Design a protein around this motif. Structure first.
Motif, PDB file in Angstrom:
ATOM      1  N   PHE A   1       0.815  -1.195   0.000  1.00 14.82           N
ATOM      2  CA  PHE A   1       0.000   0.000   0.000  1.00 14.82           C
ATOM      3  C   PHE A   1       0.878   1.286   0.000  1.00 14.82           C
ATOM      4  O   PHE A   1       1.893   1.327  -0.658  1.00 14.82           O
ATOM      5  N   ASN A   2       0.483   2.317   0.750  1.00 10.49           N
ATOM      6  CA  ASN A   2       1.294   3.502   0.914  1.00 10.49           C
ATOM      7  C   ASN A   2       2.185   3.417   2.117  1.00 10.49           C
ATOM      8  O   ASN A   2       2.565   4.438   2.666  1.00 10.49           O
ATOM      9  N   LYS A   3       2.515   2.220   2.562  1.00  4.22           N
ATOM     10  CA  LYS A   3       3.525   2.093   3.613  1.00  4.22           C
ATOM     11  C   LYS A   3       4.836   2.661   3.089  1.00  4.22           C
ATOM     12  O   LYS A   3       5.207   2.417   1.943  1.00  4.22           O
TER      13      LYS A   3
ATOM     14  N   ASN B   1      -6.056   5.327   8.409  1.00  5.03           N
ATOM     15  CA  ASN B   1      -5.072   4.290   8.674  1.00  5.03           C
ATOM     16  C   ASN B   1      -3.691   4.719   8.164  1.00  5.03           C
ATOM     17  O   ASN B   1      -3.592   5.444   7.183  1.00  5.03           O
ATOM     18  N   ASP B   2      -2.629   4.307   8.850  1.00  2.33           N
ATOM     19  CA  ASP B   2      -1.254   4.777   8.505  1.00  2.33           C
ATOM     20  C   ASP B   2      -0.771   4.378   7.099  1.00  2.33           C
ATOM     21  O   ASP B   2       0.053   5.060   6.522  1.00  2.33           O
ATOM     22  N   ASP B   3      -1.279   3.258   6.584  1.00  2.00           N
ATOM     23  CA  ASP B   3      -0.859   2.679   5.324  1.00  2.00           C
ATOM     24  C   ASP B   3      -1.722   3.169   4.164  1.00  2.00           C
ATOM     25  O   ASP B   3      -1.684   2.595   3.075  1.00  2.00           O
ATOM     26  N   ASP B   4      -2.519   4.201   4.382  1.00  2.00           N
ATOM     27  CA  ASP B   4      -3.369   4.736   3.308  1.00  2.00           C
ATOM     28  C   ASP B   4      -3.396   6.273   3.358  1.00  2.00           C
ATOM     29  O   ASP B   4      -3.607   6.845   4.398  1.00  2.00           O
ATOM     30  N   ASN B   5      -3.198   6.907   2.217  1.00  2.00           N
ATOM     31  CA  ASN B   5      -3.088   8.351   2.117  1.00  2.00           C
ATOM     32  C   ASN B   5      -4.363   9.002   1.653  1.00  2.00           C
ATOM     33  O   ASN B   5      -4.502  10.233   1.721  1.00  2.00           O
TER      34      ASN B   5
ATOM     35  N   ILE C   1     -10.171   3.589  10.149  1.00  2.00           N
ATOM     36  CA  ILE C   1      -9.819   3.014   8.876  1.00  2.00           C
ATOM     37  C   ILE C   1      -9.472   4.102   7.847  1.00  2.00           C
ATOM     38  O   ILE C   1      -8.447   4.032   7.190  1.00  2.00           O
TER      39      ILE C   1
ATOM     40  N   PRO D   1      -5.395   1.489  -0.952  1.00  2.00           N
ATOM     41  CA  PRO D   1      -4.602   2.165  -2.015  1.00  2.00           C
ATOM     42  C   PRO D   1      -4.273   1.207  -3.140  1.00  2.00           C
ATOM     43  O   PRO D   1      -3.805   0.115  -2.892  1.00  2.00           O
TER      44      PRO D   1
END
Ligand SMILES: *[C@@H]1O[C@H](CO)[C@@H](O[C@@H]2O[C@H](CO)[C@@H](O[C@@H]3O[C@H](CO[C@H]4O[C@H](CO)[C@@H](O)[C@H](O)[C@@H]4O)[C@@H](O)[C@H](O[C@H]4O[C@H](CO)[C@@H](O)[C@H](O)[C@@H]4O)[C@@H]3O)[C@H](O)[C@H]2NC(C)=O)[C@H](O)[C@H]1NC(C)=O
Ligand code: 06S
Ligand code: 06S
Ligand SMILES: *[C@@H]1O[C@H](CO)[C@@H](O[C@@H]2O[C@H](CO)[C@@H](O[C@@H]3O[C@H](CO)[C@@H](O)[C@H](O)[C@@H]3O)[C@H](O)[C@H]2NC(C)=O)[C@H](O)[C@H]1NC(C)=O
Ligand SMILES: *[C@@H]1O[C@H](CO)[C@@H](O[C@@H]2O[C@H](CO)[C@@H](O)[C@H](O)[C@H]2NC(C)=O)[C@H](O)[C@H]1NC(C)=O
Ligand SMILES: *[C@@H]1O[C@H](CO)[C@@H](O[C@@H]2O[C@H](CO)[C@@H](O)[C@H](O)[C@H]2NC(C)=O)[C@H](O)[C@H]1NC(C)=O
Ligand SMILES: *[C@@H]1O[C@H](CO)[C@@H](O[C@@H]2O[C@H](CO)[C@@H](O)[C@H](O)[C@H]2NC(C)=O)[C@H](O)[C@H]1NC(C)=O
Ligand SMILES: *[C@@H]1O[C@H](CO)[C@@H](O[C@@H]2O[C@H](CO)[C@@H](O)[C@H](O)[C@H]2NC(C)=O)[C@H](O)[C@H]1NC(C)=O
Ligand code: UPT
Ligand code: UPT
Ligand code: URI
Ligand code: URI
Ligand code: NAG
Ligand code: NAG
Lengths: 749, 752
Positions: A137-139, B558-562, B555, A220
């Motif tokens: 994802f955006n990690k 969430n940190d893994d989504d912009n 959600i 994402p």
């Protein structure tokens, strides 16, 4: 009595989610499996498990639970270490110096972007290797580096999973021992003839969603350029003769090359969700190649902004002669006609058809009669009406894997789920020409009708009926009466009329049922009934009445409902939770059926409880009063019951144990006094002529005075190891300052 | 600083001492207090000692004592040394008799909800100045009580008496010898079968007569219910209301009437309100002579007169309703009929001032909507609850036969003509659902399980709607032109439409929001939003207030989504934002920075925040209220003055703060209100009791912390004393947790 873990012999240490800051040094030497997941451990060294020669399995996931620093060689001393779980530990690398004897290793959900020989290549005994979800994802993360040939010396390796990492290409030099290869969301555009050339033991291949379908992605999402599909060479599955499971979900496929299956006689599951296959479903050449396929999932291939009258099923579907289950969620179409499913009507073992979330408006139900073996017709979620990471890395990512229909309901026979539609009344012909249905879900159709005893008569043998989350108007005592065989009735969350005082609420129909075993009237906000104030059944065994208003039904100034359950003669289980009860009138309690074995009155507001009334309940085994406001217990409980097996008293306000208590009742195995207000347990609470038969006693969450007094109880525990007491790290001192926070068990005397 | 009560100034001077666990009338009441509220405590005795030093008490409320979370023993003449006493409330104390020696000064006495069965001269007679006398609810239903003995002429002395309530007691006979001072008389559910011509002769000034619930209609009663033998209707004499010329309100609800004597009304042509619910009047409604004796009637209630189990086709309305020229409001609940045609309501069409028509709960399947046009002045068309498609249960101070809440929420109605179709089965809006409506300004479609895809044309027929309630449905948001036909729309409620929002695989389009020039308020609560299609941001140049509680920002952010990091930013005009109940453990700095800079009000309460970036308040220069209650915060910034010049209210209740930073509560001038109740504070030291510069600090809440009570507190106790202009409520509940001696008692009640 072990501490801080709970240890069992079958010999395992459950030491998880326990607020530990380092590996405990008091762990039994006999232990073979140790679970320290969800703790606060921040460091691992050679010292950490020095005690424990015989460790076979170690679970360290999710530490520190809100980096885990691991030393080079920290585990090397453990000679029987076969399995090691290091998930969600923010590891920057594969720990160095891992023992040769490992067979399972999980490094899921970390910050490892480098897979090296140094780390892996000497772990020859590896069976399963889990590296998924390290960059996705955006990690903020690097592309994954895979040293050439690193897997080549893993010659016993059966499972390898690299999903949700940025791979770009299938790593080369995979061992031919491989049974299962997971490469989902690995950013792999192209698969070639070489990629899987010598993997002749593979039973599972997972290549979803490389070249994902990103419209309306719940994460994402980045497509291949254009919206190209994954590109799979014509000869890429040539030597995959043992494949059973192929997952190609969300690889943006439009064509499916039949020849991919030329050599795939054992293919059993084929997952094509979230592709663009409407053409191929109408036209499926590949169907020819799959006469042993049991499960086919073509869910979510809808063309956005298209909502055609009908589904278009190729005739070649008729070739899938081993199909047990067909999943078509989210095709999106308006109308289902009999001719639309011709090609499925002869499949000898097609058992499940799943059409959820198609926005279907009209169905021709006689369609389903022209089928051989249909056990489950699932039509939930359509438009039928009257005529700290988001995702679980251990689950399927493109569908939920709960059963479509509750087991308890499907066990009865053929099932039809029409839940979450708009069937706001059942007309006279809603169920005409249906198969002989035994299990029927109608939950959440916002049905407001008055049932009169003719609505279910084209399907008289329903044994289990889900009617939950509607707004039924109970104004007829012959309601549901055509269903003579009915065994289970769910009427939970139908409060809409029940709330209204001035309309009629008729529950008489319960009684006209010969075989009715379980009734659920929970969360109906029942506070008044019309004419007949009593429930009655000669058969009923279970009644749930939680979430109603027994506080109002049994108000002191009203006598009418004082025997409301007495006519339930066969009753063994009764749930009276969440009825806002502050007190039960002695008479109304004594009118509870004498046949009871299980009584729940938890989550009310009870201030007192007349214990002496348990004389009239000679079969009563479990009594649950958790979550009330109780202050004290009778001092002579054996005078009152001889049957009580479990007593649940969590979340009350008991500050004192009667003298003799817990040596009072021989039959009591489980006593729960968690989250009460006990400061001690006096010597007097322990005196006893009878040896105790008590096997579990729960005392966590009480504010213990940790001082010289509790010694006598500490000895009692020491002198009663047969009496199990979980959550010892949560049986905590409140006083004094010195002992504040520590388990009452860790003080000297 | 008063204890244990809250003494206010409002001119008056009143002490609030209720619900305070008090075992006994406190002696620490400031001896200049007008009105004392001692309700809901655990007080067990009153004597002349209880109030000794309190001369100027004009009012005492002792309701619900000793209110176990047996009775209140009151001695004779306990109140006599109180000269000025006017109003006395002794409701719900389990009293066996009216207490002896009540001051002659009394105007108001309430003895409601007791065990008083005997009325006596020894109790009441010597109370000359009584305007109002409340004795209701001592004997009713299946209570264990004696019939209600009214000593002859016990009220005859009370010549100043305006109001007498004897309801919900077994009287059997309307007591004779009543003073002619009475304005209002309540005898509901008194068991009084017969009303003679002589029962109300003396009473020429009656504005209000309540005879409801005598020979009650008992079918489907929600209480214990004994009908009169027959079951006969109450029997009222031809000349029972002959002398009642001044009468304004009449309540005959649940008296089992079948016919109404037209000439009951001959000498009350100023009757305003006629309550006739829960009778058997379907005949009288179809043909009724009494409808020509009500030329000045404003409110007619004929609700719940259905005949079981008729479900007739139509309502039958007498032509004579048309002689009700003063009628403002017709209530017709629970008549129960299947259809409504225009010609059915002709007799009502010509009335000049009929603004409200209530047809709730009539299981009506169809309605010709065009019939609401040959009306003149309808402002409220209440059709909720039909079948349209495409430790005492009862409040002794409420009406007993109907709810009295407004039919339509006022914020909605003020916009204009209202149409409430709530709780029906309109599961989609067809293309002609709303033809022939008037100019509806306020429309309620709540709870219809509408599952449709709104596409910009469903409200074309009523385009000027300004307040739209669509809560509790299952709307499918798959069209960006949803609702855009409602140009003038100002308030949109879409709470509880989470059905399709739960489902990741289907589309969720919230784009339409930007198309509204005057949208002020939008409520998206409890929609369970966690994923949106194509456009990830909410946008409006208009919007002032967004309610977004009960969704899934945990959600979204969430940190893994912009994708949703600027979700609220395009709400350029926003002042009030509610992010409560979004399951947040952290808020990403970029996300918080991206909230609108115009915010004056922000709630992030009832989430699960362990940390908060206080430095980020530098980007919110108009922010006046920040609400972080019900979270898991473990410390405040010690540098608050550095991050805001504007903040007036900070709510931190229910967190885990255990140390107040140094120099706090004097960092900011603008800060009037600080709530730190139910946290983990054991002490406060002088550090935060600088008290440097000037602060507008005005209220400071600290109830519920585990204060450790030793000299370490003394500084703070001293501080309280030295700033009294800082109100600190509920001092009772500001308790010491420590040590043993001081346990359970206020911090105020200690000393060296
Ligand atoms: C593409 O398509 C393929 C084919 O369907 C999917 O493959 C499946 O993937 C799922 C999800 O990971 C696998 O399910 C997991 O397998 C374990 C079962 O192994 C056996 O051993 C256990 C005990 O070890 C037995 O109990 C069990 O009956 C099996 O015999 C489970 O351990 C997993 O965990 C479950 O329970 C634990 C309890 O703690 C939890 O941690 C989990 O959340 C979960 O509850 C889980 O069931 C499945 O086995 C795969 N199929 C095959 C044939 O191997 C792909 O997942 C799919 N890809 C994507 C991205 O969707
Ligand atoms: N494919 C699919 N699409 C859906 O839309 C759906 N909704 C619910 N489910 C359920 O999800 C469940 C999981 O099925 P699936 O995702 S297609 O996984 C495969 C396999 O991955 C899974 N399986 C098989 C063996 C195993 O060891 N572990 C394991 O997880 O069971 C399935 C086939 O097993 P089989 O070999 O007996 S023919 C199935 O039910 P059960 O068989 O009761 S566990 C489905 O009914 C769906 N499955
Ligand atoms: N009769 C009736 N049937 C209903 O089904 C209903 N549903 C809601 N309501 C509301 O119940 C409320 C109470 O009405 P009601 O029981 S008929 O009581 C009388 C009076 O008892 C009451 N009233 C009047 C004067 C006063 O000082 N205090 C007071 O409470 O107000 C009403 C009219 O008095 P008026 O002289 O202003 S024309 C009214 O709201 P308001 O907007 O306050 S008029 C109704 O709209 C219903 N009323
Ligand atoms: C029969 O109908 C009559 C006439 O409407 C009902 O009278 C109304 O009763 C209510 C409830 O007591 C009164 O409201 C209360 O007024 C006090 C005094 O201001 C206020 O403190 C309370 O909060 C409450 O609003 C109302 O004033 C009264 N109407 C008049 C004109 O006085 C009567 O209750 C009906 N009977 C039953 C049993 O419902
Ligand atoms: C009837 O249908 C409803 C809705 O499809 C089912 O309710 C779901 O049940 C699962 C598993 O028990 C829960 O975890 C979900 O929360 C439920 N969803 C909703 C929306 O309520 C119900 O199980 C079905 N009944 C039967 C007998 O299969
Ligand atoms: C209504 O009541 C029954 C409780 O008896 C629920 O079904 C049981 O649920 C337990 C789990 O709670 C299972 O172990 C049993 O097997 C179930 N019994 C049956 C017959 O299925 C049911 O889920 C309740 N319904 C709702 C909506 O909560
Ligand atoms: C639209 O109709 C609904 C339901 O009929 C109203 O909801 C009620 O509102 C009152 C006041 O908020 C509450 O006390 C009731 O409990 C509500 N009932 C339900 C079932 O929600 C709603 O207020 C109406 N909306 C408008 C704008 O008048
Ligand atoms: C949706 O939110 C709106 C706006 O916050 C709520 O309406 C208001 O509520 C407060 C009290 O909560 C009032 O003082 C204002 O009069 C109301 N504003 C209006 C009507 O615009 C509304 O209650 C919310 N809806 C639901 C179902 O919770
Ligand atoms: O005799 C009665 C008294 C009240 N009620 C109902 O109780 C509620 C509170 O007064 C009201 O609600 P409804 O509009 S359904 O009618 C009233 C009856 O149905 N019958
Ligand atoms: O790419 C995806 C993957 C899953 N899903 C849905 O998320 C949930 C979790 O797997 C599932 O629920 P559905 O049956 S609506 O489809 C799946 C997508 O919508 N898109
Ligand atoms: O759908 C309907 C139609 C009519 N009634 C009638 O309403 C009265 C009170 O609820 C009952 O006598 C019944 O005849 C209903 O209850 N439900
Ligand atoms: O009621 C309906 C009918 C069709 N679709 C279509 O289904 C797809 C996924 O929701 C979208 O393209 C949308 O147009 C809906 O969403 N809702
Ligand atoms: C009592 O319960 C048993 C077990 O569920 C059942 O077989 C029997 O039919 C019930 N009794 C009656 C009288 O139906
Ligand atoms: C901003 O809000 C105010 C009301 O608070 C309003 O007057 C104005 O119209 C809004 N802005 C726009 C661009 O509509």
């Amino acid at each position: 009595r072990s501490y801080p873990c709970d240890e069992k012999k079958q010999v395992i240490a459950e030491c998880s989610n326990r607020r530990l800051q380092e590996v405990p040094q008091t762990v039994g030497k006999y232990v073979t499996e140790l679970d320290l997941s969800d703790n606060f451990i921040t460091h691992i060294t050679n010292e950490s498990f020095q005690g424990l020669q015989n460790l076979t399995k170690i679970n360290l996931n999710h530490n520190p639970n809100v980096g885990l620093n691991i030393t080079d060689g920290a585990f090397l001393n453990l000679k029987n270490l076969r399995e090691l779980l290091l998930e969600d530990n923010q590891l920057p690398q594969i720990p160095s110096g891992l023992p040769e004897s490992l067979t399972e290793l999980s490094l899921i959900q970390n910050n490892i972007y480098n897979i090296t020989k140094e780390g892996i290549s000497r772990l020859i005994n590896l069976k399963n290797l889990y590296l998924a979800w390290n960059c996705y994802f955006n990690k903020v993360c690097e592309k994954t580096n895979i040293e050439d040939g690193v897997f080549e010396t893993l010659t016993n390796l059966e499972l390898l999973s690299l999903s949700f990492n940025s791979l770009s290409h299938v790593p080369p030099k995979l061992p031919s021992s491989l049974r299962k290869l997971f490469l989902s969301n690995t950013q792999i555009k192209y698969i070639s003839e070489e990629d899987f050339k010598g993997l002749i033991n593979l039973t599972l291949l997972d290549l979803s969603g490389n070249c994902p379908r990103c419209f309306n992605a719940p994460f994402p999402c980045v497509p291949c350029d254009g919206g190209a599909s994954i590109n799979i060479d014509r000869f890429a599955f040539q030597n995959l003769t043992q494949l059973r499971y192929l997952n190609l979900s969300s690889t943006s496929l439009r064509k499916i090359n039949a020849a991919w299956f030329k050599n795939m006689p054992h293919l059993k599951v084929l997952d094509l969700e979230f592709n663009y296959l409407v053409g191929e479903i109408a036209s499926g050449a590949f169907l020819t190649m799959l006469p042993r396929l049991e499960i086919l999932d073509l869910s979510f291939n809808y063309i956005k902004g298209s909502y055609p009258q009908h589904i278009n099923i190729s005739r070649n579907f008729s070739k899938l002669l081993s199909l047990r289950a067909l999943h078509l969620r989210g095709y999106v179409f308006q109308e289902l006609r009999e001719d639309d499913f011709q090609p499925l009507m002869q499949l000898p073992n097609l058992s499940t058809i799943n059409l959820g979330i198609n926005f279907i408006k009209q169905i021709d139900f006689k369609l389903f009669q022209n089928f051989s073996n249909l056990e489950i017709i699932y039509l939930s979620e359509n438009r039928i009406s009257p005529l700290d990471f988001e995702f679980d890395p251990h689950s399927n990512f493109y569908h939920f894997t709960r059963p479509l229909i509750k087991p308890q309901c499907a066990a009865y026979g053929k099932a039809l789920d029409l839940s979450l539609n708009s069937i706001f009344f059942i007309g006279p012909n809603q169920f005409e020409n249906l198969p002989d249905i035994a299990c029927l879900n109608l939950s959440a159709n916002s049905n407001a009708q008055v049932l009169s005893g003719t609505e279910f008569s084209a399907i008289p043998h329903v044994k289990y009926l889900d009617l939950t989350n509607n707004r039924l108007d109970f104004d007829n005592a012959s309601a549901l009466t055509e269903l003579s065989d009915l065994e289970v009735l769910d009427l939970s969350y139908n409060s809409h009329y029940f709330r209204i005082a001035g309309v009629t609420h008729h529950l008489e129909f319960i009684q006209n049922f010969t075989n009715l075993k379980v009734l659920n009237l929970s969360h109906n906000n029942i506070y008044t009934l019309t004419d007949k104030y009593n429930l009655e059944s000669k058969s009923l065994v279970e009644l749930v009445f939680s979430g109603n208003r027994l506080d109002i039904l049994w108000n002191d100034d009203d006598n009418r409902y004082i025997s409301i359950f007495k006519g339930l003669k066969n009753l063994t289980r009764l749930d009276l939770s969440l009825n806002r009860l502050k007190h039960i009138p002695n008479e109304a309690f004594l009118n509870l059926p004498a046949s009871l074995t299980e009584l729940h009155i938890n989550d009310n507001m009870l201030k007192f409880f007349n214990w002496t009334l348990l004389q009239q309940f000679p079969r009563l085994e479990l009594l649950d009063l958790r979550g009330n406001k109780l202050l004290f217990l009778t001092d002579s409980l054996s005078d009152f019951t001889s049957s009580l097996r479990t007593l649940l008293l969590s979340h009350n306000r008991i500050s004192h144990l009667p003298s003799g208590f817990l040596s009072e009742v021989s039959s009591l195995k489980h006593l729960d006094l968690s989250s009460n207000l006990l400061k001690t347990i006096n010597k007097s609470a322990l005196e006893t002529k009878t040896t105790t038969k008590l096997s579990m006693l729960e005392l966590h969450g009480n504010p213990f005075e940790c001082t010289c007094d509790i010694g006598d109880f500490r000895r009692w525990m020491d002198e009663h190891l047969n009496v199990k007491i979980p959550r010892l790290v949560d049986v905590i001192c409140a006083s004094p300052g010195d002992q504040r926070g520590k388990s009452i068990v860790s003080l000297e005397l």
